[PDB]
A paper describes a structure:
The macromolecular complex necessary for force and motion production is called the glideosome, comprised of an atypical myosin A (PfMyoA) and filaments of the dynamic and divergent PfActin-1 (PfAct1). [name], the causative agent of malaria, moves by an atypical process called gliding motility. Actomyosin interactions are central to gliding motility. PfMyoA is a divergent myosin, sharing only 28.66% identity with non-muscle myosin IIc (NM2c).
Here, we report an atomic structure of the divergent [name] actomyosin system determined by electron cryomicroscopy at the end of the powerstroke (Rigor state). Using likelihood-based reconstruction of helical specimens and a real-space modeling approach aided by molecular dynamics for the refinement of the model, we present a structure at a resolution of 3.8 Å. Actin-activated ATPase assays showed that the phosphomimetic mutation T417D located in the hypertrophic cardiomyopathy (HCM) loop of the PfMyoA heavy chain (at the TEDS site)23 resulted in a ~3-fold enhancement in actin binding affinity while Vmax is unchanged. The use of a PfMyoA motor-domain construct with a T417D mutation increased occupancy of binding to JAS-stabilized PfAct1 filaments in cryo-EM preparations, although even with the improved occupancy, PfMyoA binding remains sparse. , There is no electron density at the active site of PfMyoA in this reconstruction that can be attributed to a nucleotide. This structure thus represents the Rigor state at the end of the powerstroke in which no nucleotide is bound to the motor domain and, like Rigor structures of other myosins, PfMyoA adopts an inner cleft closure in this state. The JAS peptide and the ADP nucleotide are seen without ambiguity in the electron density at the same positions as in the undecorated filament. The binding of PfMyoA to the PfAct1 filament does not induce major conformational changes in the actin filament or in the motor. Similar to other myosins PfMyoA interacts with the filament through five canonical structural elements. These are the HCM-loop (407-430); Loop2 (625-643); Loop3 (566-580); Loop4 (363-387) and the Helix-Turn-Helix (HTH, 540-565). In PfAct1/PfMyoA, the activation Loop (524-539) is not part of the Rigor interface, as is also the case for Myo6. Despite the divergence in sequence of the actomyosin system found in the apicomplexan glideosome, the PfMyoA residues that are part of the interface define a conserved actin footprint.
Residue numbers in the entry:
A (entry chain C), C (entry chain A): 6 to 375
B (entry chain F): 2 to 84, 86 to 768
D (entry chain E): 189 to 375
Write the structure that this text describes.
């Protein structure tokens, strides 16, 4: 009866049964394979460790994420993650429920066609809609008018919606996310004196990035005040027991979101792709779009991203309009929560893609209901 | 009442095999054929019914059958069904015979209507052949008194008798005093389905004779000591307040001039893991609770007993059961021990052992991080008076018992070194101690019940009886229910053995090649569940011996090594917590939580000698035999290994004899007469493998009938042949068969019977 | 039916039938030949005395061990020890049972190939697996995650295992063992005034090393307190009846395990090869490897090796992690006991090397099943 | 790693001088195979792959597979148990991290350097590995000059023998002003 809302995140699959306020399953999109042969007779072989078990055994595994920038690069790994998600973690059969997958805007067509081909051929799902992560975050935001800037581990969307109407000529995506910030954090920790090279070391760098990085208000002022190291240096304890002492790398670790030329990319920052997406809209709705800058995703969980984002956009915008970012708590789950609220409607149940309709049109019907 | 796991499970039992017959001839014409369907608002309104006999309406399609609900009498509204249409034998009175193999259609609802009609006509028995089928009437039908014993015992012809316990037991005693071969009657069923009642019917039939009518004390002794085996032996499961979690097996020596004079009780496959942990709605063995509520203040003051929720061996939330008294039943336990003439001092020692087991189960352990090891098993401080009380009540030196729990000692080329145990392994030592003391207490008092009644020279030939369970079909199964299904696969293999033997030798006696009879192989399931080196139990021995063994590693190790056969299959949902076995009755799912809590049993002989050195000769009689090993008992001390040894010996005791089978089915859950509920009864059909026994009944030349009964039954097909009496009766019968259009592949010509397949039986009856 | 577990130790063959808790045969790996011609007519000649009889007649024999550092240097002597072990001591034929030999890590290939060539050509064994001593000690340890440091008479392994997976880039062996400690004990007893030169004298030095040597907690403090000889001097009685008075040689006799520069070797101590093997593992599993330092072998039977090893590793390790050595009793037999538990499994019986498979591939199949 | 596989053959090198003898064996005997599986299968039949070496003790080392599995750990680092990528996949992976116009000028000049590129056929194996990884329409041209051991130092001559570069030193008085942090302003 109830639908089954699955967020195929780039770094966290967040899935759960519809009609809830929080996902039952929050586990990373990791397929790990053992680099070492087993030697203790009387154990499980299990050539592919999927999900959270692959992260609890991270020291003996090659841990590979199948999602590079919102795009499945290995369909066997993604099929293992869906198989673990449905059968081993949610413990609900795909035949019992409709599934609601989700998808980063401007995703290539092969992800939709191959995705629904998997979910009707491999899994026997009766009906399935795939959706945009940003519009679902605007369902969970409690509004119908605003700009969603998403930032996961593969993507960073900026989808504006004015009163229920999408603006497909103003969707600007950006390939700056948590994974590029972990890689950049590894490079500046090579500058401090720590060398993280393997995949488990990248996950330790992700825990450092979660617990220590924060967005500065003015970056040059924090560099000049952090020339005199007083309180900007912090400590961290590893699963080895050592001590990490971070200096500038608390506020230049997330600064690559706003100045992407640190990463050597010829792109624009989150404030200039957001404001640049405001200027690609028409000139009447902008007052209603400068007023609702809805944050989302786990890469907007830093400190003062609302403050820095409001002062950057307020610098860029005309000064007569107030810039009001909406940074709710549980903004990591604002996709999935919206996926509940969308799938718990009565009109939306006229919009699934049934099994027989895939059996008629093939995967191309998904390009007619999106 | 019936539950949604029973409605859902019984709905999953419902299969479709034969197609529905609607037509008379090649033209699209109907005959007003009565069918069965599962789609009816009666079934959607009454959960007591799963099949509705309808009648096919005239002028319906071939792809869609228009029917009118007639049985039960609903409205006369013709509604359409998917040919969900099952065949029926409408033209047959179920009171006319008693063998379901004589039904033309052996789908599920013809069996439910045959057994339904016979049970509702208070005819509770039905000969499956060579099975018998008992259904509980929850009352007396009167056909069990001594006059009916004389009637079904004393007639010179016994095949004119209707199906009964007394008829099959008569066949068993006739085969006993005819040829010197032991017969064994296996009463199988759920423990509330009147297996004790039919057991007492066998006890009065064996008791009664022509001269020695009541010249015995054996039924007096065993039946008087029934609530001792029921006292220690019965536990509440989710199916019964009075479930039988083992097998009583009584070997009775029958006089020719009289009845029983000698006998013995031996229990088999007593579950041990029930003592340590239980489920939520499951009790322990009842003698713990009814001992904690039935004792007086002298017994509670002497034993230091507590409330029924203050014992960790006992389920604290299932102690109170409305159906069981647990107070005055204990007086029947005391007097029932006095019926085998045990002194009140000795009885006081028995329940001192019981109070010592329940006291010992409260003893906590701790890990000491300061030893030579990492952790050390230690006994908790305030549980020391609990422990000294526990060995005191079990009459053991507590310093030496603590020595056997906390310290291992071995000798390696002349070097006695004392290793220290781990906490979990010492918990296996304490739990194994409680379970071993309990079971050898149980078998000790069984040896006192047999000490009255035994043949003192031993059993040369005997007359065996096995109280035994059926298939636990339901979902949340565990190691105990795995053992249950393993035992039922052994008994099932015995069933295919003896049915292939009788039908093969009966093909031999009538000059018919037995190669057209096929053995239905139980060898795959017995290999996957039991074969030493490649089974599920061998790998459970591995995960007891693999040192970082979990339960996920077990299900996955069986998943990666038993993939060569389809009889093991890993389940989809929670693929490490659930594994599905293809049993002979079909897919059964097993939960994997707490396997290694249940299997790990270390009864080290170094402790067994300390218990044999007790000042009490009672405790010295508890552990008899069982020599010291001084090495690994790890190959044989597990509950899997002991289960395969007891199951090996029990199958040696039943395969050496010639068996006869009783199927006990109870119609409702309200204990009311003439209340019929097709789901729970259907689960008992699939759960005693009665349906698959009917598949084996309809295997091969199912419908045979003697030449006189074929020429009498099918007289009206060819009246010119049967009334001739000059042409031979064999030629008469095959003229009837060739008249109705039957090829010679479907019938074989016996010298005493006409041999018909089910296809030839259905083409014959058109 | 039951397998036959044979530990080819460097100084003690420990063999017995599987499914036991202690070996039936604990006898040293000694082949002795008489240096003197016999003169009493009416005796046994017996040109090679093998095993414990060679040690009970040690005064008239040249006693030689065929195992120099876990490696057979004389195959005729090792074949005599196997022949005595199977036929004369265990009293069980090799054709009746499978044999389970064991092997040092980083043993050269000629020991495996020549070993299985002996056990299929000379002895007619139906099936045989050879195994690593350290992983067997971790079977008998009751765990599946820990570091085994083995120390026999030829080897000193440090094999880490994290959850059933070997780490073959972190196996560090060391040629410090009981035989180098007997030789070093002979040199310091040359310093005290006792001269042990022959082989039987080396065995008397081994009995002194067993009964008198113990590992100090802090070696410099025990030297400075042992400058004033109060209780550090002990006595010992020989098979001659004299008196040995040992001074410093109770705590500098096993100190060469921790400071190998006393022996003039450019190697590292047991604490620095153990901790050095921790640092060659990945950085997540080390918490589970600092927690289980499993001792094994007869050269870890000293006093306070757990205390000295914990204070040395605790000095080397980061101080936030607890170092928990596991020093079980019967750690001399922890190889063999594990060899029972390994050979008494049902999955392991899919891993033997059968007679016909050696008849197909030759000895090279042993390099495919190890 | 060469010490570990020589533990597999039957030689035990543990000390530091023994590591230097292993370095001389690695210089005189190791060479990169063209296809490693083909050289394993042809080296199952030991015909010419076994060589000899004389120590400063006078003994004889006989190497088998350890001529071509000794430098193979550069290309398959999982022999060393490292979760890294090979030289061809870190090189090509560094090509893919550049922008998409300059790659034609970067697939064309794969300049080798250092003493660990002095093996046999490292240009051939590196070109066939990158040519397997790269798009096939571009030619992969490795530059393996002789004296590539010294290509650092020689460049250090050519850099220090310029006239513009002499505007880029860090003088004594500038260190006396800023301390060492000035080196992070001129690098
Ligand atoms: C928290 C970690 C390490 C330690 C416990 C943390 C502490 C804090 O490090 C030190 O203080 C030691 C020192 C160091 C040396 C000088 C200095 O002014 C500061 C630190 N750093 C080093 O030796 C480098 C060596 C190195 C290798 Br090879 N290539 C590298 C590439 C770039 C940079 C450095 C390197 N090093 C320890 C490593 O990479 C190892 C492999 N690191 C790890 O995988 C994990 C365990 C990270
Ligand atoms: C327990 C033993 C001996 C005795 C009963 C034990 C008592 C305790 O020794 C003494 O007190 C006597 C003395 C001695 C002399 C001066 C001194 O300040 C202390 C002791 N030591 C000696 O004469 C040396 C002579 C020696 C020969 Br040649 N090369 C050697 C190389 C190095 C060292 C010494 C030597 N000596 C007795 C031996 O080697 C003989 C062969 N030892 C043995 O095989 C066994 C029986 C060991
Ligand atoms: C060129 C060298 C040696 C020799 C002249 C070269 C010739 C070639 O070796 C042999 O043929 C002899 C034999 C050997 C034995 C059997 C066999 O099928 C092949 C060779 N090998 C041995 O005895 C081992 C013993 C050993 C110790 Br302890 N732990 C070890 C750990 C792992 C492996 C082996 C060992 N051995 C000689 C050594 O380690 C000594 C310390 N090696 C050296 O420092 C230098 C001089 C290396
Ligand atoms: N508290 C935090 N601070 C900083 N970054 C975080 C925090 N929590 C999560 N992240 C980053 O956000 C990412 C999670 O993004 P996620 O919500 O999974 O996006 P998606 O669902 O699209 O994968 C993680 O990779 C992590 O690096
Ligand atoms: N009690 C002890 N104290 C000190 N050393 C001992 C003791 N017992 C044995 N040893 C030493 O340990 C060695 C044991 O070797 P062993 O256990 O056989 O290892 P391996 O099996 O690898 O040969 C003996 O040679 C002996 O020297
Ligand atoms: Mg997301
Ligand atoms: Mg050893």
């Amino acid at each position: 009866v109830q639908a089954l809302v699955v967020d195929n995140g780039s770094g966290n699959v967040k899935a759960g049964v519809a009609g809830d306020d929080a996902p039952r399953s929050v586990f990373p999109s990791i397929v790990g394979r053992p680099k070492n042969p087993g030697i203790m007779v009387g154990m499980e072989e299990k050539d592919a460790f999927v999900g959270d078990e692959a992260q609890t055994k991270r020291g003996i595994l090659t841990l590979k994420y199948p999602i590079e920038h919102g795009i499945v690069t290995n369909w066997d790994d993604m099929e293992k993650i869906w198989h673990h998600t449905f059968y081993n973690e949610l413990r609900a059969a795909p035949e019992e429920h409709p599934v609601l997958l989700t998808e980063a805007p401007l995703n290539p067509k092969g992800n939709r066609e191959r995705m629904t081909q998997i979910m009707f051929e491999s899994f026997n799902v009766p009906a399935m809609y795939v959706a945009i992560q940003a519009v679902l975050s605007l369902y969970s935001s409690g509004r119908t008018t605003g700009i969603v800037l998403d930032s996961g581990d593969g993507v960073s969307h900026t989808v504006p919606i004015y009163e229920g109407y999408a603006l497909p000529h103003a969707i600007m995506r950006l390939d700056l996310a948590g994974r590029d910030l972990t890689e950049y954090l590894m490079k500046i920790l090579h500058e401090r004196g720590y060398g993280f090279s393997t995949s488990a070391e990248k996950e330790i760098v992700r825990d450092i990035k979660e617990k220590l990085c924060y967005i500065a208000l003015n970056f040059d002022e924090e560099m000049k005040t952090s020339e005199q190291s007083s309180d900007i240096e912090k400590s961290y304890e590893l699963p080895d027991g050592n001590i990490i002492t971070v200096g500038n790398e608390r506020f230049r670790c997330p600064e690559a979101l706003f100045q992407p030329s640190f990463l050597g990319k010829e792109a624009a920052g989150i404030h200039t792709t957001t404001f640049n997406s405001i200027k690609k809209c028409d000139v009447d709705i902008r007052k209603d779009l400068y007023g609702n800058i809805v944050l989302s995703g786990g890469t907007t969980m830093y400190e003062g991203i609302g403050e820095r984002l409001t002062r950057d956009i307020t610098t860029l915008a005309p000064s007569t309009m107030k810039i009001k970012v909406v940074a709710p708590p549980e903004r990591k789950y604002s996709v999935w929560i919206g996926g509940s609220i969308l799938s718990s409607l009565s009109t939306f149940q006229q919009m699934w893609i049934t099994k027989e309709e895939y059996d008629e049109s093939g995967p191309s019907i998904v390009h007619r209901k999106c | 009442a019936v539950t949604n796991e029973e409605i859902k499970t019984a709905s999953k039992i419902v299969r479709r095999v034969s197609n529905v017959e609607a037509f008379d001839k090649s033209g699209s014409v109907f005959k007003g054929y009565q069918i069965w369907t599962d789609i009816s608002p009666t079934i959607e309104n009454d959960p007591n019914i799963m099949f509705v006999k309808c009648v096919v309406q005239q002028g319906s399609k071939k792809e869609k059958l228009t029917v009118v609900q007639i049985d039960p009498p609903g409205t006369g509204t013709p509604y359409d069904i998917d040919p969900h249409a099952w065949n029926c034998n409408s033209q047959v009175d179920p009171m006319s015979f008693g063998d379901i193999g004589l039904l033309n259609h052996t789908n599920i609802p013809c069996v439910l209507d045959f057994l339904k009609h016979r049970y509702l006509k208070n005819q509770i028995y039905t000969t499956a052949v060579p099975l018998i089928v008992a259904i509980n009437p929850y009352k007396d039908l009167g056909n069990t008194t001594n006059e009916w014993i004389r009637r079904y015992r004393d007639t010179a012809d016994h095949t004119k008798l209707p199906p009964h316990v007394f008829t099959c037991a008569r066949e068993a005693l006739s085969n006993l005093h005819g040829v010197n071969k032991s017969q064994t009657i296996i009463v199988s069923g759920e423990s509330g389905a009147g297996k004790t009642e039919a057991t007492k019917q066998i006890m009065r039939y064996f008791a009664s004779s022509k001269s020695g009518n009541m010249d015995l004390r054996i039924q007096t002794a065993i039946m008087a000591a029934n609530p001792v085996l029921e006292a220690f032996g019965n536990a509440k499961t989710i199916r019964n307040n009075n479930s039988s979690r083992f097998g009583r097996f009584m070997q009775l020596v029958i006089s020719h001039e009289g009845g029983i004079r000698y006998g013995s009780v031996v229990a088999f496959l007593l579950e041990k893991s029930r003592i340590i942990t239980q489920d939520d709605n499951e009790r322990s063995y009842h003698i713990f609770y009814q001992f904690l509520k039935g004792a007086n203040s002298t017994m509670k003051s002497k034993f230091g007993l507590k409330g029924v929720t203050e014992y960790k061996l006992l389920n604290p939330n299932s102690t109170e059961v409305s159906g069981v008294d647990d107070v005055k039943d204990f007086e029947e336990v005391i007097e029932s021990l006095k019926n085998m003439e045990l002194s009140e001092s000795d009885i006081e020692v028995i329940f001192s052992i019981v109070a010592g087991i329940l006291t010992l189960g409260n003893v906590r352990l701790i890990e000491k991080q300061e030893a030579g090891l990492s952790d050390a098993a230690a006994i908790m401080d305030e549980d020391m008076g609990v422990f000294n009380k526990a060995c005191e009540l079990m009459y053991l030196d507590p310093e030496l018992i603590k020595r056997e729990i906390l310290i291992k000692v071995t000798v390696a080329g002349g070097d006695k070194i004392e290793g220290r145990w781990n906490k979990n392994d010492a918990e296996v030592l304490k739990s194994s101690l409680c379970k071993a003391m309990y079971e050898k207490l149980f078998l000790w008092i069984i040896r006192h019940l047999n000490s009255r009644i035994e043949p003192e020279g031993g059993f040369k030939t005997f007359m065996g009886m096995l109280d035994i369970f059926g298939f636990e079909v339901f979902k949340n199964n565990s190691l105990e229910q795995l053992f249950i299904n393993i035992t039922n696969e052994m008994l099932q293999k015995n069933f295919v053995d003896i049915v292939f033997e009788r039908e093969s030798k009966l093909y031999k006696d009538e000059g018919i090649s037995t190669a057209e009879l096929k053995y239905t192989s139980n060898k795959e399931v017995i290999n996957v569940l039991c074969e030493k080196g490649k089974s599920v139990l061998s790998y459970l021995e591995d995960q007891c011996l693999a040192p970082g063994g979990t339960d996920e590693k077990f299900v996955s190790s069986c998943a990666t090594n038993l993939k060569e056969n389809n009889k093991f299959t890993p389940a989809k949902v929670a693929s490490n917590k659930n594994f599905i076995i293809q049993h002979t009755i079909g897919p059964i799912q097993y939960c994997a939580e707490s396997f290694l809590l249940k299997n790990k049993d270390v009864l080290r002989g170094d402790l067994v000698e300390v218990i044999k050195d007790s000042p009490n000769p009672i405790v010295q009689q508890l552990f008899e035999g069982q020599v010291i090993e001084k090495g690994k008992i790890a190959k044989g001390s597990l509950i899997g290994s002991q289960f395969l040894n007891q199951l090996t010996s029990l199958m040696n005791l039943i395969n050496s004899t010639e068996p006869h089978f009783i199927r006990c089915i109870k119609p409702n859950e309200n204990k009311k007469p003439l209340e019929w509920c097709e789901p729970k009864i259907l689960i008992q059909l699939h759960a005693l493998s009665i349906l698959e026994a009917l598949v084996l009944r309809q295997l091969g030349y199912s419908y045979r009938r003697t030449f006189e009964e074929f020429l009498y039954q099918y007289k009206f097909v060819d009246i010119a042949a049967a009334e001739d009496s000059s042409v031979e009766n064999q030629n008469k019968c095959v003229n009837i068969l060739k008249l109705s259009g039957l090829s010679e592949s479907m019938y074989k010509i016996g010298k005493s019977m006409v041999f018909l397949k089910q296809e030839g039986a259905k083409i014959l009856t058109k």
